[PDB]
Amino acid sequence: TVAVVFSSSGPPQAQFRARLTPQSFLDLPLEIQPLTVGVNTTNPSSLLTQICGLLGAAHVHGIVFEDNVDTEAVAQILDFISSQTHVPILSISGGSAVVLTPKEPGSAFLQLGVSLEQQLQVLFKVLEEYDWSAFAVITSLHPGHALFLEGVRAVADASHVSWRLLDVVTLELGPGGPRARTQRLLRQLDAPVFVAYCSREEAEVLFAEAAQAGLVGPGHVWLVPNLALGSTDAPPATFPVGLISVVTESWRLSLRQKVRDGVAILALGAHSYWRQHGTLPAPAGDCRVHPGPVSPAREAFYRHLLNVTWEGRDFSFSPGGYLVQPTMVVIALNRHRLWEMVGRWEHGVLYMKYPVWPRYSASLQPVVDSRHLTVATLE
């Protein structure tokens, strides 16, 4: 048996209850009966009680999570839960769907996303199709900067092409302070391509400052990873058109589709399992007692869970709590302040919607500009 939880969307939660009311989807090769839980607000005590009490009340085997307004520092609690009660969980979306690299030793979190190295290789692959090679790296004083800088430095030295790098800059991006030191320094730059890694508020403040000190015209291009851009459904202001980022697949899908996907993953795991051992794995659950050394049966179950298929996709998990061989899409800001697809990535080859990068003037009319001569030939 499995359970599901919904979080932090009132009017949608009515549709969530309506879609929970069906007996089953009647497709999964299992006879597990779901159960639903709904929590008013996301808080530590609330989540702790509503998860372990529910888990110990009705003898469940597995649980799957659902996202929220995407406020940070929420996955750690679920990781602690997994460590304590030794029960596998699964995240599907939202801010909780961000990689948490040094997970607890004995846990099994299985949050789907993209690791920073994989999340970064795509920008270098797309930066070679047009071959700009400027590399003005801007990083804020954020906790995750150390791994990012090390990864980019390591990749730069083992790549295919020369990749001339201009310089690296770090700056304080706090909510309040004297701007002058960063403001004068930022304008002391010259590079056609920028890559920046920071948080949402840091993105707002840096982008406003750059727009103030004339670095947002049609000549430059910005690259940001998935850690930024927040909602993915609400377009904020002050964003210069042309921002490029990379996000995973199924972003435009529905919550019902995502929860069905998670249910299918766990069901296919169980379906592959019962053939090996003959029955469902024993459900270990105890909020209060907290026993358990390393258990070989549940470890074997976790091993058998790591590889699935079907539904026109793939989910192969590494020892780290993240999937490998991923399928994501390049996204960009269209001329009407709206997100749209640009490029796909399937099996280590890259594509693009356009053969050239448009770039935009102040008005809707683009500037063809000089150079980039069109040349024709035939076989």
Partner 1 sequence: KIVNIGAVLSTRKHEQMFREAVNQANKRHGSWKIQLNATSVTHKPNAIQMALSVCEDLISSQVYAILVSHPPTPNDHFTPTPVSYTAGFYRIPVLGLTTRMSIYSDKSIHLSFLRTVPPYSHQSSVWFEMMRVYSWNHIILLVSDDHEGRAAQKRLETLLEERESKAEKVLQFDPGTKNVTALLMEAKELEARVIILSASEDDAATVYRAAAMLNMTGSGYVWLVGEREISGNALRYAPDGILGLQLINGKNESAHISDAVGVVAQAVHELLEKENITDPPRGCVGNTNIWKTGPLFKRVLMSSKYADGVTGRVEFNEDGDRKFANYSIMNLQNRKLVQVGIYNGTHVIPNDRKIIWPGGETEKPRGYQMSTRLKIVTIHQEPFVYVKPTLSDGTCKEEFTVNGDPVKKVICTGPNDTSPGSPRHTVPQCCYGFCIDLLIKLARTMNFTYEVHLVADGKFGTQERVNNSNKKEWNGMMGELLSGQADMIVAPLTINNERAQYIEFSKPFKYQGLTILVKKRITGINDPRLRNPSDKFIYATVKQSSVDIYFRRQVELSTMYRHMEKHNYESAAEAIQAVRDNKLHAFIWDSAVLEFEASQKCDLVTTGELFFRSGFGIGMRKDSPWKQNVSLSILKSHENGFMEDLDKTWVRY
Ligand X SMILES: *[C@@H]1O[C@H](CO)[C@@H](O[C@@H]2O[C@H](CO)[C@@H](O)[C@H](O)[C@H]2NC(C)=O)[C@H](O)[C@H]1NC(C)=O
Where along the sequence are the contacts to partner 1 (CB under 8 A)?
A: 41-46, 48-49, 52, 71, 73-74, 76-77, 80, 84, 100-102, 143-144, 147, 154, 158, 174-176, 287-288, 290
State which residue, 94 or 269, has the beta carbon closest to ligand X. Answer: 269
Q: Give the one entry of ligand X, partner 1, none that residue 304 binds, where binding means its C-beta sits below a cut-off of 5 to 8 angstroms depending on kind.
A: ligand X
Q: Compute the least distance from the CB of residue 111 to partner 1, in Å.
A: 14
State which residue, 126 or 305, has the beta carbon closest to ligand X. Answer: 305
State which residue, 173 or 328, has the beta carbon closest to partner 1. Answer: 173
**For helices 255-277 and 10-20, what crossing angle results, to 10°?**
40
* Bridging pattern class, strands 244-248 and 328-333: antiparallel
CA 102 from chain centre, in angstroms, equals 17
Q: Is there a contact between 292 and 339 (Cβ–Cβ < 8 Å)?
A: no
**43, 49, 307, 325: which one binds ligand X (CB under 6 A):** 307
Helix H or strand E segment including 322:
none
Q: Give the one entry of ligand X, partner 1, none that residue 338 binds, where binding means its C-beta sits below a cut-off of 5 to 8 angstroms depending on kind.
A: none
Between CA 64 and CA 141 the distance in angstroms is 34
State which residue, 141 or 168, has the beta carbon closest to partner 1. Answer: 141
Nearest residue to the partner ligand X, using Cβ: 307
Phi, psi angles (nearest 5°) of residue 339 = -75, 145
Q: Is there a contact between 323 and 309 (Cβ–Cβ < 8 Å)?
A: no
**21, 162, 188, 276: which one binds ligand X (CB under 6 A):** 276
Q: Is there a contact between 193 and 134 (Cβ–Cβ < 8 Å)?
A: yes
State which residue, 24 or 307, has the beta carbon closest to ligand X. Answer: 307
Residue 313 in contact with ligand X, rule: CB under 6 A: no
Q: Compute the least distance from the CB of residue 44 to partner 1, in Å.
A: 5
Q: Is there a contact between 45 and 10 (Cβ–Cβ < 8 Å)?
A: no
What tokens were used for 289? 């007692």
Residues at the interface with ligand X (CB under 6 A)? 272, 276, 304, 307
